Every structure is written in C-alpha cells, then in structure tokens.
Amino acid sequence: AKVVDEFDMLRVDEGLKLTVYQDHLGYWTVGIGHLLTKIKDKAKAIQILDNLLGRKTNGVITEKEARQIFEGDVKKAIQGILSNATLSPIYDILDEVRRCALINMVFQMGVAGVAGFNNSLRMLQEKRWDEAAVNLAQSRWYRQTPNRAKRVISTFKTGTWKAYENL
C-alpha cells in the first residue's frame, strides 16, 4: 500500500535481522532491533524466540515474522506515546508519516528521552515544521547520530518519506 512504511523506515535506521544477532555488548537480537536477551547465551535467545513465535525456530525467521514482532513493538511505542502527558497531544495532531517519525525517535531513545525535547515538541505540536527541524538539529541526538537524525528531521519537514526513498 505505502511505498515506504514504518517497518522499512526503522529497517534503514535499525538493522533488519532474520537471524539471531549478537552485538558488542553480547546482547542477542533479532528482527527490527527486538532485544531477545542480554545474557550471552544463544540457546536461551533462541528459546525466547521460539516462545515469541509459534514454531521451533533454529535462530532463523522469515520477514513476515519479523513484521509481526515489529508490529508488536510499534503497538507498545504508540501506547507509550499516548500514555505520556508530553508526547500525547503531539501524536494526536500529526499525520501518518510524521507519526512514524515520532515513533522512530521513541525507538532510538525512550519515551522519556523523546519527552526531553521540550521546545522542539512545541514546534511540532503547532505544525511549525522547519522551525522544529532547527531546534532538533541543535541536540545531542543530532550530534551522536547525525545521519539517522537527518532522515528523521527531514521526514518531519516534508512528511513525504523522501529521506527513505531507497535507504
């Protein structure tokens, strides 16, 4: 239906893994940045994956199942936004595309982290794009992850998925 959606948006930013993946901290992961466990044990990571999914996987999953796992994480991200006093009124007035960009921020940093952008959030709440992009660019989020921040901020400015046309 939509050329780019929230699953492919966060696939560009957060890698898509169809096999259990261990990062530098030893944390086991799968799908769109879905943390299975933080214990350096591959057998428990796969066991957790088996209970989440409905089969005896050997660490490998399909893209359909990764979208199922991700849709669950998105439902929880929306619940965290609508349950937050700061982020809830912004989510209401934002369109579908810009809603995905707010969820993207809640994926990287927590709901409490996104709620720290007091002035930038007021700019978004008032549909004052571009002014929000300037305040969001002057942030630690932009400093640590410039390229991911550029794509997300551009999405808030345009609302056109243009930054994610082809990763």
Query: Sheet of 34-37: strands edge to edge?
Result: 16-22, 28-32, 34-37
PDB experimental method: X-ray
Protein fold of 6-164: Lysozyme (1.10.530)
Question: How far is residue 27 from each of residues 16, 75, 118, measured CA to CA in Å?
Answer: 15, 23, 32
Catalytic residue chosen out of the listed positions 23, 96, 126, 130: 23
- Amino acid identity of residue 142, one-letter, is Y
Distance CA 27, CA 65 (A): 20
This PDB structure is determined at a resolution in Å of 2.5
Domain boundaries, the chain: 6-164
Give catalytic status of residue 126 as yes or no.
no
Half-sphere exposure of 129 toward its Cβ, with a 13 Å CA cutoff?
Answer: 14
3-state secondary structure of 101: helix
Q: Cα 47 vs. chain centroid, distance in angstroms? A: 25
Catalytic residue chosen out of the listed positions 6, 8, 13, 14: 14
Give catalytic status of residue 23 as yes or no.
yes
Residue 39: other Cβ atoms inside 10 A: 12
